[PDB]
CSV table of C-alpha atoms and ligand atoms in Angstrom, one decimal:
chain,number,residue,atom,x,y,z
A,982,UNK,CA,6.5,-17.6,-3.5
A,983,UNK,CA,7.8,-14.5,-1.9
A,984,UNK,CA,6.7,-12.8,1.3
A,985,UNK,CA,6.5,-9.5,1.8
A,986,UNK,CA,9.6,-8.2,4.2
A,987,UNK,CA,12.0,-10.4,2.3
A,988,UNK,CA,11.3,-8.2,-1.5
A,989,UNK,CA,11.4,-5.2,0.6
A,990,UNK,CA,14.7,-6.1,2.1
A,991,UNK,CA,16.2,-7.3,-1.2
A,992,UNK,CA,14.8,-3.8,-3.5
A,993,UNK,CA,14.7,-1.1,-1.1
A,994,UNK,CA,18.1,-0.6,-1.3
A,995,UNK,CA,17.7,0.0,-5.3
A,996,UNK,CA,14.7,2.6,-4.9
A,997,UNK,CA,17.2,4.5,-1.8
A,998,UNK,CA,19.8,5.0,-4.7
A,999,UNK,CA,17.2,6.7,-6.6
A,1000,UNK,CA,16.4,8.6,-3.7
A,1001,UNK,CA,19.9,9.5,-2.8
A,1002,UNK,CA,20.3,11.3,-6.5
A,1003,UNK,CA,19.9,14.9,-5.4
A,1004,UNK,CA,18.5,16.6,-7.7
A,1005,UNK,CA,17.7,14.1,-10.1
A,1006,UNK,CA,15.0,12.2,-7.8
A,1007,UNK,CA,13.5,15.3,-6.7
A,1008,UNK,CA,10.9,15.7,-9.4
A,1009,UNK,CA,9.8,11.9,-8.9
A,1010,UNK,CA,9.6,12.2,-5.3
A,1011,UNK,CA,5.6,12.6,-5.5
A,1012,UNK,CA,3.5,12.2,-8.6
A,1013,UNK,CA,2.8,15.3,-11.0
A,1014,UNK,CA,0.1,17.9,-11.0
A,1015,UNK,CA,0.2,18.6,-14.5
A,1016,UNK,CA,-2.2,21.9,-14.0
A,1017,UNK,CA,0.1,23.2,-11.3
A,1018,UNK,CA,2.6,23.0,-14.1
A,1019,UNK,CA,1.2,24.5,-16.2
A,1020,UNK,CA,1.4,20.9,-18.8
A,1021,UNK,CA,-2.2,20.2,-19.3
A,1022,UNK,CA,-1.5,17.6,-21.9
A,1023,UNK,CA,0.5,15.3,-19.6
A,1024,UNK,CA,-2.3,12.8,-18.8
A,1025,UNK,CA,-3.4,12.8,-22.5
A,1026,UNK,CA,0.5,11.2,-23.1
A,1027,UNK,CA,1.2,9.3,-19.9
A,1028,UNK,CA,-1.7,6.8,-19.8
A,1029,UNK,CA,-0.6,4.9,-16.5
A,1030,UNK,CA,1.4,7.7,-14.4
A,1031,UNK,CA,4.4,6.0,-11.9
A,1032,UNK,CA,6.4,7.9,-9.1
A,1033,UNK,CA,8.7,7.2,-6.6
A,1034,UNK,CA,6.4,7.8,-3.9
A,1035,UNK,CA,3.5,4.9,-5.4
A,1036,UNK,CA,6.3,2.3,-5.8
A,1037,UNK,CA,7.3,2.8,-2.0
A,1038,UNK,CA,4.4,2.4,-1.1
A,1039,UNK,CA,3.6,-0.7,-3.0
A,1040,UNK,CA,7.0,-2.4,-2.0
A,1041,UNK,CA,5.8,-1.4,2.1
A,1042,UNK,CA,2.7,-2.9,2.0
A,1043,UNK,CA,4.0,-5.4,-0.2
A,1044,UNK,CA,1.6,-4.8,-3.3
A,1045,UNK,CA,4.5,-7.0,-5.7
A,1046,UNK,CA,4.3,-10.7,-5.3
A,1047,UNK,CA,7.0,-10.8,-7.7
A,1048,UNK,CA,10.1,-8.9,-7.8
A,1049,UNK,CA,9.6,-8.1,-11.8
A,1050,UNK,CA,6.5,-6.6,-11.2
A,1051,UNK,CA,8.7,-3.9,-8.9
A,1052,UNK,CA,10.5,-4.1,-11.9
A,1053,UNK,CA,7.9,-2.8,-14.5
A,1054,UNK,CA,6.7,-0.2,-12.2
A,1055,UNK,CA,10.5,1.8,-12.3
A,1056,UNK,CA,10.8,1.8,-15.8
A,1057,UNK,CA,7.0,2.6,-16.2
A,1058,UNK,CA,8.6,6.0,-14.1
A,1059,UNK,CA,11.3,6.5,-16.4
A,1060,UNK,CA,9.3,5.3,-19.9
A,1061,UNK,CA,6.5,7.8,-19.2
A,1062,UNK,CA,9.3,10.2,-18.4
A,1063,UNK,CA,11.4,9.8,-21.8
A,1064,UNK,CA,8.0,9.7,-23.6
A,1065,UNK,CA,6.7,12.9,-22.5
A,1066,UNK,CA,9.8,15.1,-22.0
A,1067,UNK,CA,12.3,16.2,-25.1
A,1068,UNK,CA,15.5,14.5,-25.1
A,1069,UNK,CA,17.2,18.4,-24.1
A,1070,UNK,CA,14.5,18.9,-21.0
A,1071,UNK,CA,16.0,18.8,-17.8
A,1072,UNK,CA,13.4,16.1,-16.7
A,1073,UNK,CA,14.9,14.0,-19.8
A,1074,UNK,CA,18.4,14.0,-18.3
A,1075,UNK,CA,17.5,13.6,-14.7
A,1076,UNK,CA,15.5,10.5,-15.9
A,1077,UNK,CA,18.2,9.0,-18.2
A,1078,UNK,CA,20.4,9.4,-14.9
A,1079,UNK,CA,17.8,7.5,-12.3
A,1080,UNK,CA,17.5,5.0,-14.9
A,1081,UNK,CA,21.6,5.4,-15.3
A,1082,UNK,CA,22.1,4.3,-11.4
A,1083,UNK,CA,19.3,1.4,-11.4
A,1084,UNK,CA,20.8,-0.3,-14.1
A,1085,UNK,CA,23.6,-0.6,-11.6
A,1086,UNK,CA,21.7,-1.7,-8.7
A,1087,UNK,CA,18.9,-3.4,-10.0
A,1088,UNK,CA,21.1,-6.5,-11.4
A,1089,UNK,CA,23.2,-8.0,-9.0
A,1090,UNK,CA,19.9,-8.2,-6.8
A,1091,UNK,CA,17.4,-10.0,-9.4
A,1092,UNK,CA,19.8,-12.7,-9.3
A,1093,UNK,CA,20.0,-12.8,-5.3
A,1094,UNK,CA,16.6,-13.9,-5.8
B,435,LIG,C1,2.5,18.4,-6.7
B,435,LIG,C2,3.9,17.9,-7.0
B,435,LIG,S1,4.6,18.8,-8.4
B,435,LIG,O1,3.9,18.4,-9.6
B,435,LIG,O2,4.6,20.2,-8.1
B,435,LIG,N1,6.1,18.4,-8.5
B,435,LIG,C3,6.9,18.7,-9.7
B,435,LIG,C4,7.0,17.8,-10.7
B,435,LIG,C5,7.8,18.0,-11.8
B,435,LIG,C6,7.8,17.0,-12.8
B,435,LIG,C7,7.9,15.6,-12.6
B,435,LIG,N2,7.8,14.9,-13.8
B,435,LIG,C8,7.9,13.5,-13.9
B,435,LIG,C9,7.8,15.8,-14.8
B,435,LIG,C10,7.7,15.6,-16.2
B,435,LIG,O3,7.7,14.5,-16.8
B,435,LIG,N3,7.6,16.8,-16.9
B,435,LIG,C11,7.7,18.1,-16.4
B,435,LIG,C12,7.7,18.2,-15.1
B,435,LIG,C13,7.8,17.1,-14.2
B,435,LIG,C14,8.4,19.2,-12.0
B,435,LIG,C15,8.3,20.2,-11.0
B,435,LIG,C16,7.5,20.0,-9.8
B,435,LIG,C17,7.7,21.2,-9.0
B,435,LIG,C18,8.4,22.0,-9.7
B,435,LIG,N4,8.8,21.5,-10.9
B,435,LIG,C19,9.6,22.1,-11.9
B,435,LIG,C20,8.8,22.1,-13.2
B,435,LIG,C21,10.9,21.3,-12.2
B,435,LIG,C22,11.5,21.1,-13.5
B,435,LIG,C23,12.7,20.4,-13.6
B,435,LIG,C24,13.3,19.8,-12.5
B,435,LIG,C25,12.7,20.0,-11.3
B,435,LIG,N5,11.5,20.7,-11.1
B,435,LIG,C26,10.0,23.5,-11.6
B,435,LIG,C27,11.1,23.8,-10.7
B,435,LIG,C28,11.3,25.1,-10.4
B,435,LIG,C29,10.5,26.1,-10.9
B,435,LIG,C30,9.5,25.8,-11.7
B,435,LIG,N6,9.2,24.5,-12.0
């Protein structure tokens, strides 16, 4: 078992460093309005949308029981990310950066716990 303020102490810090990435985060700050885009297809091809903004949320009100499940939800960002953008979009790169910086963070901490 868990309890909430303990899995946000122990994976906030991981989400700030996404945050800090200026201006990789910015686009993942909020979720996507895919007609403001202009990308109309984007909900046809990401099936289970993920932003920073939904996983903050989740980790505040303690939504994960489990630290994997916090887990799932970041790479759900960056899958749905890789699998809608082209490898050259400047989404693509930002993403592969984000993901870049977790790998750092994310695995000294799963072993904390
Ligand atoms: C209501 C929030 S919003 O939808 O407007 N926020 C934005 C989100 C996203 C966005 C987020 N994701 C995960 C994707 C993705 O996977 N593909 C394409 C676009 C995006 C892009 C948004 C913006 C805003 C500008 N942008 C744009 C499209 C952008 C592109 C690249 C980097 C940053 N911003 C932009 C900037 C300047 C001028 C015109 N458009």
């Amino acid at each position: 078992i868990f309890k909430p303020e303990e899995l946000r102490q122990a994976l906030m810090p991981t989400l700030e460093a996404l945050y800090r990435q200026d201006p990789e985060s910015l686009p993942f700050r909020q979720p996507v309005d895919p007609q403001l885009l202009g990308i109309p297809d984007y909900f046809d091809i990401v099936k289970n949308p993920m932003d920073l903004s939904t996983i903050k949320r989740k980790l505040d009100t303690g939504q994960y029981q489990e630290p994997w499940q916090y887990v799932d939800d970041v790479w759900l960002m960056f899958n749905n990310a890789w699998l809608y953008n082209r490898k050259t979009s400047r989404v693509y790169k930002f993403c592969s950066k984000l993901a870049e910086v977790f790998e750092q963070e994310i695995d000294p901490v799963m072993q904390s716990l």
